[PDB]
Amino acid sequence: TLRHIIWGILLAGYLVMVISACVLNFHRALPLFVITVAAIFFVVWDHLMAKYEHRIDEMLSPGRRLLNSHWFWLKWVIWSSLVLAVIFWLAFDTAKLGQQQLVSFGGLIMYIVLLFLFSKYPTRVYWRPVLWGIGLQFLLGLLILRTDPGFIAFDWLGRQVQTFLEYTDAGASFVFGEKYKDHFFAFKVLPIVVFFSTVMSMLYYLGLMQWIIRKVGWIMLVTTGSSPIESVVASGNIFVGQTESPLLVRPYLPYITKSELHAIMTAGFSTIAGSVLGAYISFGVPSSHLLTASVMSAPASLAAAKLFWPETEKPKITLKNAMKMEDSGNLLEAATQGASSSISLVANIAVNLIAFLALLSFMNSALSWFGNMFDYPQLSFELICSYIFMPFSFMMGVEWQDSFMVARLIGYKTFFNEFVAYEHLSKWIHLRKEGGPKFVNGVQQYISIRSEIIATYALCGFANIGSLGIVIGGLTSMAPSRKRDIASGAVRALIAGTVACFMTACIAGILSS
Amino acid sequence: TLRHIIWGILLAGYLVMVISACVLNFHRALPLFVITVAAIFFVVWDHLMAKYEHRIDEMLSPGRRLLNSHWFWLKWVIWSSLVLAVIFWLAFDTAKLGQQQLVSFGGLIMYIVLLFLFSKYPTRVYWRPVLWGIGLQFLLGLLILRTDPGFIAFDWLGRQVQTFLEYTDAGASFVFGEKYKDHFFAFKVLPIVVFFSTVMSMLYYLGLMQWIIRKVGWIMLVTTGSSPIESVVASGNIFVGQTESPLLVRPYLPYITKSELHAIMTAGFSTIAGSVLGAYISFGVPSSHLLTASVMSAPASLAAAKLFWPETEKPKITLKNAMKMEDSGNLLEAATQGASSSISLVANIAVNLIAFLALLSFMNSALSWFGNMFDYPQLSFELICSYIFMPFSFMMGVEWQDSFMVARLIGYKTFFNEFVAYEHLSKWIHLRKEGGPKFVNGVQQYISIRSEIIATYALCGFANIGSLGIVIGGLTSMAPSRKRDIASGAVRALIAGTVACFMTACIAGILSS
Amino acid sequence: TLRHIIWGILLAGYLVMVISACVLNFHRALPLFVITVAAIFFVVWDHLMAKYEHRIDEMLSPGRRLLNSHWFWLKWVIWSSLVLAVIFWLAFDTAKLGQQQLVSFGGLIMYIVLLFLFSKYPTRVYWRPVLWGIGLQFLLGLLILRTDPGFIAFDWLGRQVQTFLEYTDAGASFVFGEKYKDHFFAFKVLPIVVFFSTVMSMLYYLGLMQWIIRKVGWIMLVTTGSSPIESVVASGNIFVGQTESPLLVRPYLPYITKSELHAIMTAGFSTIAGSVLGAYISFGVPSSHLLTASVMSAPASLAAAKLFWPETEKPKITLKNAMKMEDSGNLLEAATQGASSSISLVANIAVNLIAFLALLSFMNSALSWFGNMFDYPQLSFELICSYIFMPFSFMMGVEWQDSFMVARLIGYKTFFNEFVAYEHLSKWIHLRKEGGPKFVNGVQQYISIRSEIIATYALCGFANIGSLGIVIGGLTSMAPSRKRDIASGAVRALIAGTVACFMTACIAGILSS
């Protein structure tokens, strides 16, 4: 009762400091005007969330009883109003590009069919997530790709991440000298993994990382109707990695079902971490699209995993987000516990990219003299992955000249880890920013403006076949009483995870121009 | 009974080898003449410590019975003889510098008052450590700062550490090539942390590190009268770090009191390790002063922590130094176990200085555009820490032109780890060794000869708010039955630790010239 | 019953792919013709190993009953036929070099005598391993050093490892930039340790590493008659390191005898890993000889450890190779679990070579001013190790001009780890490949063609006194119920391990020219 006088008037003195700089020079005051008004607004929308929780059931009830009675009529309307909304909107994507963008919508159905025919419970599909999970990310993607204020936001939210890429050049220029531009990956990019792992833990300590997960999750919960753990983990995988998302719900992991656990694991493969998020940007990948792909992969993780292995028995656990809590004492412990957790994280990244990129040049040279058998060198591992994933590359709506070159990146990401796929993307990002020739002799040498947006989304996921060993061991270290359930669902989780990356990837193909 | 014939005559053959080179060319024979005579002498002073332990109680008793009877007179003399000794000596520090050196003595009382008014047991203070703990380091500091043979010793003991800074350039030039001068921190300085962690474990295996702790501790024990574990840990923190000092007494950690545990933790924050001791010297910090600060911080750790959280119940454990033992089989295991323990030690240092130095340039740029709100960039994190710790900087006797610039280092050391504070000190050490301008436009650009001695001592401690997370987890991993006692004393340990660094820092301010 | 139709006809489609490229251009088709015929052949020799296991006892029995009856005659023949075979062959090594190659054979007996006089069970020696364990590696060494098709094999098998040294330059040029030739050890050589630790685990997952151990082991088992765990571990130490070889038999480790455990530990010291095998080649060491030394050290490990601490009680365990099994799910988990196990492996190597190479230049400078006492600098640690191991260096048949310079490498390998010994060898490999002067002033400056083959074999082992701390802790972490047995045998294991390296080293001295 005594502490809040100090902390309150100081934060009320902050409200003095907001309105002080709001009066003079308001145009430079715009980010502080927007945030602190919303910072007042979201506390009000959360303090009245619990205080008016009585009226939350009292005001939602007289319509919902009428909505259940009108569901005899509404299920013939709302299920048919959206189909008319899609087909009318398919008259207005053809003006963008009739060639490939119809194939992307033709592929988005085909990825559903590739999961529905190969799901293990086809008749047990509860279609309310798996249609609306595409309906979320499409309504999410049409806001933040197609509409202009949504493009202004995630560009600016993308570009201010790019300023954090500069803030680590105080640390990486110090621990590694002024020559840190030499040896550019381990000395620039791996400090970004350290600095984002120390920001992610500060935001997790301050509750801000727990807060967005409870807001993105609850929006994704009620609209999809999944289990209340799964909406936390799938929305949690936007920010934290594949091995830290079930750590959010780790007291509740032995109690979930096999499909509630499958969709936890799939959402781990379907997205990237906020830790390695700035590693990918520093290669040269567009930050605005890669942030976009992480957000849309959370409803895609529901729309793929609840379609590929649906839930039957009972979602036994409710209200695990409010039970989800921290730990660290102060802020600078959490900035240290975030950095000391980045010890093994930048080490396992660095030795995989020694291990896996050498297994390129092994397999690019082993299959070279295996191809030299038939008078045919230029038979490489990269050429074989192009023709294996020529179906999935063209299915998500890539031009035929670039469908062969993007299918290397799916082959890089599925077999090897996705860092192999992103700088080999960023060798082709950076090559087209330079004004360069397309075909030097016959090599495609870059992709496009267009399908580098799609190949950004097709890789935004940890869904290599290598992380199946880490996620099994990561989940068995949490819930060892379900080791039979975790290991049996992991192989089903990659394909549901890789398609969940692709279901976001074709939505850019629908929304390309 | 058979082995000591081999080991004895070989070491007696060493005594032949001493006196051989002692006869011819004695002037080059001085370090071997001094050590091996003392090596005979300290074995004699320890073999007769146990053999004449009967007379140790028989000869100390007839005076101590008279000393207890004369304590009716001696407590009016010795408590008043020292006060007359101080005030007469305050007539002979003013000739050095009357401006700031009186403020340092004015600050040393003020740091006592800042702990005594904010101790939790003010009436329960047993003043025999907390006055003599300043009386030790002052008698220790006046010997090794003021007097000329004490200056010759710790300069030479400082300069021969600087030769170990060269000995790692066989290893760091090999593991990291001849280009190791590029990327100077991780490739020169972090091998010094490895090479000093492998020397510290060899000296711990050979007993030499256990021996100085039993000699510095027992001198600090009887003169302060603290608990016999605490005099081991506080003197142990001279050499080993904050997370290895309670490992010395780890079978005895669940049995200590809450204040015996507080002063264990505070001495961990109040000092530096011998591991990172050569990291600090390689930046450019004077080695003779930094070794001096580590020695004086052990009685300062008693004089601060027994003042800030005194002991009431009962010191239940005696003779834990002789119970303190190892482990490793041979010497070269201990040179490996010291190097393999330096895996996480140079890794957690390297990622913190990526994490924390980026959180400078985050907060130096976040508060820049927060200052740009009020038409005021150059509002940085560095400027705010200057005015927050302008009290403590000027209190320990720094010039007003340099009190603002040194208070950044306290702000660097309290919030971030002290490696941030030392190279930002060594940017200003190295800038004044070059003949440079003081004010370029208005920036102070270095400090002085004088207050770089004080700022050396104000930072010789692990007392950041970040290590409160490591020391809690480091002590809970040892004595998990006292987790409530450890976590409640850690916040009290930093302030008692940061002042214990400062109580050494003002003594250089008294002894500056 | 359904899966083998897919996997069979695909591998039968591979047999189509073999014979397709076998018809046209057979000269380029030679490695694929040799392997896949043998790949058919070894499956046939293993499918008929179990199917005709009934006739394996039915056809071996009518001769063995006659062999036991003729052993009254055969033990006077075969024990005397080999002695006549040796002495006749000692008439035909003198034509190669009568000076030093007789000393190598004179040393090979002397190493037996140095183990037999200092074994703890001299009367309990079962001489059937310890004579035939030299008889294996001599028959193994005469095939692959002396004979010309055996030289063609291990050169080509050596040179195709040298191609894997190039394959890591896709990974090390990426994680560490194009400037990775700068800082040549940690940025080129330590990725080779990563890439070979990720190949070794893939070959262990595919069974190919388990297969050669079951073939080299069973050949070494029946011919030596050791315990069936020990023939797995000693042959296993050809490939995996000292801390992963008892991990092969870790469910069976509390049941072995003290001498079965001694020879497990000794074989760990006597050989090198396949992990650090390409680290040694990248320094400049000849790959064909270093692969040769790893193969011959497995029978040398039997011939030394069963001689130095023989087995008395009972070999209680049989058929542990077939019980030896994995783990990892797919291949790319095992390529990740091999890389993530190389985290601590390249870190403990990198900090030891910071720790140990600095303890050269410490001891090279501490003994320098200890030598300056007697007007004698150039008294170094390197000079003392030359005269300590002048016996063992000349005993294995090195020229007297080079016996002093090679004995530094034994002193480098016994006290410090063998990476110190190999690049200080490869400073002298690389110096003689350049056309250089032998004596600049008096320094030998390289060795020879000849004794760099011997010094390659004298170092192919983990038998430093530093790894006694890792192997004790590595075995106690596996079988903690035998900690008294492991710690008592480790000191006996180094000397039996260092001689087992030397027993291979003198065989090159016999086979030098």
Residue numbers in the entry:
A (entry chain A), B (entry chain B), C (entry chain C): 101 to 426, 429 to 615
The study reports:
To date, several nucleoside transporters in mammals have been identified and classified into two SLC transporter families: concentrative nucleoside transporters (CNTs, the SLC28 family) and equilibrative nucleoside transporters (ENTs, the SLC29 family). Human CNT (hCNT) 3 (SLC28A3), one of the three members of the SLC28 family, is classified as a sodium–nucleoside or proton–nucleoside symporter. Compared with the other two members, hCNT3 has the broadest distribution, substrate specificity, and transport activity for nucleoside-derived drugs. hCNT3 is also an important mediator of drug response and resistance. Previous studies have shown that the truncated isoform (Δ1–69) of hCNT3, named CNT3ins, is an endoplasmic reticulum membrane protein with nucleoside transport activity.
Here, we report the cryo-EM structure of CNT3ins at an overall resolution of 3.6 Å. Then, we tried to purify CNT3ins in 0.1% (w/v) digitonin, which has also been used for the structural determination of human γ-secretase, and analyzed its structure using single-particle cryo-EM. The final three-dimensional (3D) density map was reconstructed from 99,489 particles with C3 symmetry, reaching an overall resolution of 3.6 Å. The processing scheme for structural determination is summarized in S5 Fig. CNT3ins consists of three protomers, a trimeric shamrock-shaped architecture that is formed through trimeric contacts of the central helices from each protomer. In the structure of CNT3ins, density is clearly resolved for residues 100–614 of each protomer, which can be divided into the core domain and additional N-terminal transmembrane helices (TMs). Each protomer of hCNT3 is formed by 11 TMs (TM1–11), which is consistent with the previously predicted 11 TM topology of hCNTs. The core domain of hCNT3 is composed of two subdomains, including the scaffold domain (TM4, TM5, TM6, TM9, and IH2) and the transport domain (IH3, HP1, TM7, TM8, IH4, HP2, TM10, and TM11). Considering that the structure of CNT3ins was obtained without nucleoside and no sodium ions were observed in the structure of CNT3ins, we used the structural superposition to identify the putative nucleoside and sodium binding sites of hCNT3. As superposition shows, the residues involved in nucleoside binding of hCNT3 (Q341, T342, E343, V375, F563, E519, N565, and S568) and vcCNT are identical, which indicates that hCNT3 possesses similar nucleoside selectivity to vcCNT. The observed position of the transport domain indicates an inward-facing state of hCNT3.
